[PDB]
Scaffold this active site. Structure first.
Site, PDB file in Angstrom:
ATOM      1  N   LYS A   1       2.791  11.612  -3.942  1.00 38.55           N
ATOM      2  CA  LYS A   1       2.024  10.959  -4.196  1.00 38.55           C
ATOM      3  C   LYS A   1       1.096  11.444  -5.170  1.00 38.55           C
ATOM      4  O   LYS A   1       0.076  11.485  -6.170  1.00 38.55           O
ATOM      5  CB  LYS A   1       0.822   9.744  -3.684  1.00 38.55           C
ATOM      6  CG  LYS A   1       0.327   8.635  -4.058  1.00 38.55           C
ATOM      7  CD  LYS A   1      -0.494   7.922  -2.806  1.00 38.55           C
ATOM      8  CE  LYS A   1      -1.721   7.242  -3.358  1.00 38.55           C
ATOM      9  NZ  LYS A   1      -2.071   6.010  -2.358  1.00 38.55           N
TER      10      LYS A   1
ATOM     11  N   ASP B   1       0.384  -0.939  -0.229  1.00 36.28           N
ATOM     12  CA  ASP B   1      -0.323   0.015   0.378  1.00 36.28           C
ATOM     13  C   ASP B   1       0.950   1.387   0.250  1.00 36.28           C
ATOM     14  O   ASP B   1       1.616   1.427   0.926  1.00 36.28           O
ATOM     15  CB  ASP B   1      -0.802   0.153   0.963  1.00 36.28           C
ATOM     16  CG  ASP B   1      -1.696   1.269   1.651  1.00 36.28           C
ATOM     17  OD1 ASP B   1      -1.956   2.189   0.975  1.00 36.28           O
ATOM     18  OD2 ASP B   1      -2.214   1.034   2.667  1.00 36.28           O
TER      19      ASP B   1
ATOM     20  N   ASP C   1     -13.063   5.474   2.460  1.00 30.92           N
ATOM     21  CA  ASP C   1     -11.734   5.641   2.807  1.00 30.92           C
ATOM     22  C   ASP C   1     -10.967   7.630   3.700  1.00 30.92           C
ATOM     23  O   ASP C   1     -11.020   8.228   2.622  1.00 30.92           O
ATOM     24  CB  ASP C   1     -11.050   5.500   1.961  1.00 30.92           C
ATOM     25  CG  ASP C   1      -8.673   5.245   2.323  1.00 30.92           C
ATOM     26  OD1 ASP C   1      -9.404   5.630   3.295  1.00 30.92           O
ATOM     27  OD2 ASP C   1      -8.898   5.203   1.313  1.00 30.92           O
TER      28      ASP C   1
ATOM     29  N   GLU D   1      -6.931   0.770  -4.511  1.00 32.04           N
ATOM     30  CA  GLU D   1      -6.884   0.748  -3.246  1.00 32.04           C
ATOM     31  C   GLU D   1      -8.174   0.402  -2.560  1.00 32.04           C
ATOM     32  O   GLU D   1      -8.209  -0.759  -1.832  1.00 32.04           O
ATOM     33  CB  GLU D   1      -6.946   1.785  -3.025  1.00 32.04           C
ATOM     34  CG  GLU D   1      -5.409   2.298  -2.693  1.00 32.04           C
ATOM     35  CD  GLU D   1      -4.645   3.760  -2.457  1.00 32.04           C
ATOM     36  OE1 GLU D   1      -5.588   4.068  -1.909  1.00 32.04           O
ATOM     37  OE2 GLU D   1      -3.736   3.844  -3.240  1.00 32.04           O
TER      38      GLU D   1
END
Ligand SMILES: C=CC(=O)OCCC[C@H]1O[C@@H](n2c(NCc3ccc(Cl)cc3)nc3c(N)ncnc32)[C@H](O)[C@@H]1O
Length: 384
Positions: free
Chosen positions: A71, A10, A198, A175
């Site tokens: 990211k 992850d 999330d 994800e």
């Protein structure tokens, strides 16, 4: 003898996590500091390059040269309005190299620039190393997760980061899909709609997937790219800065060290408020030599964050509109991200779904790596 295992990584915005599937179960692998997650931070100093915990630990003393959030840049053009906006709030420099962003730092007394995938490859090298330390042999195969909203360029840049890290990237997987796999939601054998909620340290993502005979399809993605746990820390900080002004007639806001110490205590009190109905904060010589003692109830913290928690339902409603689904058509609810431990957050979501159960038993900071590890073992078997 038995061949090398494949790992599930992850690669998170601020934290990363690595797992391995062995003996029919997932092992989330602890790093050299014994931590089951590792900060996605790369620090450049006068003498070395630090990755993970060591980089995160020295951020206060070296903010211009400690890179995080790569990211947010990965697979984007310098001209992307997302890059231009995000740049305004980072302590490190972002430069343009032919419409490609590069993070620019000072490292060993020299100016150096790195592409976001180069920074991510360093965090991936660290995760690879963490796994190798545990396994006792070199690791070459991996599944890497990405957000479901990632486009072709963002997915490819992440794959490039894994290949630069010396990994054979078995698959780049979503994800929320990894989270659904961790809960065995692809092992039921008809069509089902699943919603992944999330909420992390600084991002909020809602994804709607359909699962038909183990096949996943992304139906909708929504969220708020700048909403997370840090915002709830901010509400506590502002409250205590005002409480100190009221009680002591002093503003601690212009003392960088005082604000940092207060922020650190606020984040710890917030976590206590997820399992206790009250929390105490105490900081010796916070400002002007004054020892600051305070207390806060879960009710008052919920009030201070009311609009932020309540705003998490707007991307839920939005993802449902985009997927052309009524809320009664969602079969499974999955919680991912450390901030989903907040009782009020769980309550808002469950009540919105008329009391439907939440799939939350898997540590929400480890669920994605857990599913990536499961899928990596299936994929290395087929490839071999
Ligand atoms: C720390 C490792 C890791 O991978 O973090 C990823 C998630 C980070 C975010 O999630 C928040 N959060 C967390 N996080 C887990 C945690 C954090 C620190 C420690 Cl010491 C232990 C456990 N737990 C929480 C809890 N019981 N309630 C409310 N928000 C919680 C945390 O305030 C931050 O905004």
């Amino acid at each position: 003898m038995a061949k090398a295992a494949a790992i599930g990584i992850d690669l998170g915005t601020t934290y990363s996590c690595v797992g391995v599937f062995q003996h029919g179960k997932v092992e989330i692998i602890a790093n050299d500091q014994g931590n089951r997650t590792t900060p996605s931070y790369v620090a450049f100093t006068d003498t070395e390059r630090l990755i993970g915990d060591a980089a995160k630990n020295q951020v206060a003393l070296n903010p211009q040269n400690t890179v995080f959030d790569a990211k947010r840049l990965i697979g984007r053009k310098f001209g992307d309005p997302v890059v231009q906006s995000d740049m305004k709030h980072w302590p490190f420099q972002v430069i343009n190299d032919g419409d490609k962003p590069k993070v620019q730092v000072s490292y060993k007394g020299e100016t150096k620039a790195f592409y976001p995938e180069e920074i991510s490859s360093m965090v991936l090298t660290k995760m690879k190393e963490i796994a190798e330390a545990y396994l006792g042999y070199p690791v070459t195969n991996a599944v890497i997760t990405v957000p479901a909203y990632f486009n072709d360029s963002q997915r490819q840049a992440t794959k490039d980061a894994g290949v630069i890290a010396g990994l054979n990237v078995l698959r780049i997987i979503n994800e929320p899909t990894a989270a659904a796999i961790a809960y065995g939601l692809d092992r039921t054998g008809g069509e089902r709609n699943v919603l992944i909620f999330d909420l992390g340290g600084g991002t909020f993502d809602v994804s709607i997937l359909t699962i038909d005979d183990g096949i996943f399809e992304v139906k909708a993605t929504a969220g708020d790219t700048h909403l997370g746990g840090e915002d709830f820390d901010n509400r506590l900080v502002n409250h205590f800065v005002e409480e100190f002004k009221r009680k002591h007639k002093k503003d601690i806001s212009q003392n960088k060290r005082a604000v940092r110490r207060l922020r650190t205590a606020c984040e710890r009190a917030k976590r206590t408020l997820s399992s206790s109905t009250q929390a105490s904060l105490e900081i010796d010589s916070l400002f002007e030599g004054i020892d600051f003692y305070t207390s806060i109830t879960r009710a008052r913290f919920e009030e201070l964050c009311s609009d932020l928690f309540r705003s998490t339902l707007e991307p839920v409603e939005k993802a449902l509109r985009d997927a052309k689904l009524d809320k009664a058509q969602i079969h499974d609810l999955v919680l991912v991200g450390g901030s989903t431990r907040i009782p009020k957050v769980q309550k808002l979501l469950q009540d919105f779904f008329n009391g439907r159960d939440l799939n939350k038993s898997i540590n929400p900071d480890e669920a994605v790596a857990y599913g990536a590890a499961v899928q990596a073992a299936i994929l290395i078997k087929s490839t071999r």
